[PDB]
Amino acid sequence: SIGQMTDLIHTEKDLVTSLKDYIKAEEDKLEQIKKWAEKLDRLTSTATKDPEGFVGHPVNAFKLMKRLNTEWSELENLVLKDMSDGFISNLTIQRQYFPNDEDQVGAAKALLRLQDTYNLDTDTISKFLTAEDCFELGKVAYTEADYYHTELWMEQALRQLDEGEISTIDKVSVLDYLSYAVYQQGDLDKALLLTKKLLELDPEHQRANGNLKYFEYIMAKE
Amino acid sequence: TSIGQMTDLIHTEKDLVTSLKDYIKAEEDKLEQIKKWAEKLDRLTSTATKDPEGFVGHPVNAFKLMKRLNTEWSELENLVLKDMSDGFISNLTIQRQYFPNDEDQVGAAKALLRLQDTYNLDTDTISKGNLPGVKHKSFLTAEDCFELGKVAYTEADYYHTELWMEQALRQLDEGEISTIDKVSVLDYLSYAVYQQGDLDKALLLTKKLLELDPEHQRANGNLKYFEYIMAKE
Numbered sequence: 113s114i115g116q117m118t119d120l121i122h123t124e125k126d127l128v129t130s131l132k133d134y135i136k137a138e139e140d141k142l143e144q145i146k147k148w149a150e151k152l153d154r155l156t157s158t159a160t161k162d163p164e165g166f167v168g169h170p171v172n173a174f175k176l177m178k179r180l181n182t183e184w185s186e187l188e189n190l191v192l193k194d195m196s197d198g199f200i201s202n203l204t205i206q207r208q209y210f211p212n213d214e215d216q217v218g219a220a221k222a223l224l225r226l227q228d229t230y231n232l233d234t235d236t237i238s239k240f241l242t243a244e245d246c247f248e249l250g251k252v253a254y255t256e257a258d259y260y261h262t263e264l265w266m267e268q269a270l271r272q273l274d275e276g277e278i279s280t281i282d283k284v285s286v287l288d289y290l291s292y293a294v295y296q297q298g299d300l301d302k303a304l305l306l307t308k309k310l311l312e313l314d315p316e317h318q319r320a321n322g323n324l325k326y327f328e329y330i331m332a333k334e
Numbered sequence: 335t336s337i338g339q340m341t342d343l344i345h346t347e348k349d350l351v352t353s354l355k356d357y358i359k360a361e362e363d364k365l366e367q368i369k370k371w372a373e374k375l376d377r378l379t380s381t382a383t384k385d386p387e388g389f390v391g392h393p394v395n396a397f398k399l400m401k402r403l404n405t406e407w408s409e410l411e412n413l414v415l416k417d418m419s420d421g422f423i424s425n426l427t428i429q430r431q432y433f434p435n436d437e438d439q440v441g442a443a444k445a446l447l448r449l450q451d452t453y454n455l456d457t458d459t460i461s462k463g464n465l466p467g468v469k470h471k472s473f474l475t476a477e478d479c480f481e482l483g484k485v486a487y488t489e490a491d492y493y494h495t496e497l498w499m500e501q502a503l504r505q506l507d508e509g510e511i512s513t514i515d516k517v518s519v520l521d522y523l524s525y526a527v528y529q530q531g532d533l534d535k536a537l538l539l540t541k542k543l544l545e546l547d548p549e550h551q552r553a554n555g556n557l558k559y560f561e562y563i564m565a566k567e
Binding site for chain 2: 114117118120121122124125127128131132134135138139142145146149152153156157158159160162163164165166167168169170171172173174175176177178179180181182184187188191192196199200203207210211212213215216218219220222223225226237241245248
């Protein structure tokens with residue numbers, strides 16, 4: 113319902129403000145540390161410039177022994193200090209009303225169906241969807257034997273990869289999925305070409321080699 | 335402790351600074367990643383609250399929303415919990431084997447005291463490091479002075495306790511920002527003074543302390559005590 117989604121949106125907005133509070137806290141700690149590190153840097157610089165004269169000074173041996181024995185431990189404790197508990201506690205609480213996998217897949221199938229209903233191409237929809245997003249949609253289709261959508265979305269994922277989008281997915285796996293889905297469509301020509309793309313990328317790929325031969329076969333027997 | 339040992343310590347400390355700087359870089363990269371994420375998301379969810387019906391119209395906005403909440407916030411969570419400090423802490427931990435310890439710090443402090451005696455220097459000249467024919471310009475903090483006073487105190491050296499607590503208190507008086515309260519140093523000071531025998535000074539300082547903190551139990555006891563023995567003197 114509209115209301116459930118509305119509450120989700122509000123929750124996420126609050127999570128963002130809380131997140132920004134965490135960021136602010138961490139930045140303040142880092143600036144304290146940065147200033148500290150600046151002081152130490154000027155210090156150590158002057159000492160390394162002339163270590164003998166440095167340990168001439170009667171105060172310097174004491175100050176050095178103190179910094180090393182005491183101050184660096186204070187510094188250590190500040191570095192290790194956890195700034196994240198408020199945000200994590202809060203997020204932990206909000207997760208109670210979060211969606212699950214089934215909600216996510218469901219929302220995805222809904223995306224496919226809207227794609228059909230409004231006659232939209234994957235690029236226009238994607239422009240935002242990431243390569244990984246497209247790939248996921250492709251796999252959602254794939255699990256239900258909807259190879260038309262599997263095909264369209266793996267194609268989009270691959271296209272985004274080609275435009276040089278940085279992503280966690282390699283062209284090879286998506287080429288595998290794609291060529292498989294296309295073969296299942298019946299476009300053996302396309303499937304063959306894509307298989308050849310895959311082999312150009314990973315030449316040792318077992319199924320792609322086997323499929324190069326097998327596709328050439330059934331194509332011959334057509 | 336030799337020139338060479340000090341030199342090795344100094345180089346190690348220089349390297350630890352480099353390591354800490356690397357830590358700073360790592361943390362900044364982490365935070366900037368997070369800020370950009372939150373920036374992007376803030377744009378989304380703001381536009382969404384403006385018209386939530388129109389926003390979750392798209393199965394796209396809805397799909398991205400469900401995914402962000404079920405998966406991506408867990409990724410952000412993992413990034414938040416991610417320790418950027420391991421390299422620095424590991425290196426510092428390793429170097430600490432060849433660090434000075436407590437005895438070395440006390441040792442260096444007493445060494446400083448004996449040097450003060452030997453060259454007849456007042457605590458101010460030493461503390462401000464303004465020294466003739468010496469190039470490096472180090473200075474002691476009120477807190478440093480306090481520590482020297484306490485090192486003296488531990489050895490029943492009330493002469494140095496008195497001098498160095500007086501220097502600390504004096505630096506506090508200029509309003510040097512510091513971690514020490516005048517009251518603790520006044521405690522030490524007045525006690526050391528009395529141990530030397532200057533009952534008037536100890537009494538006056540006890541009164542300064544109480545003037546600062548009137549509920550200070552021990553100071554109260556000391557006030558009655560001093561006034562008594564002063565009267566029966």
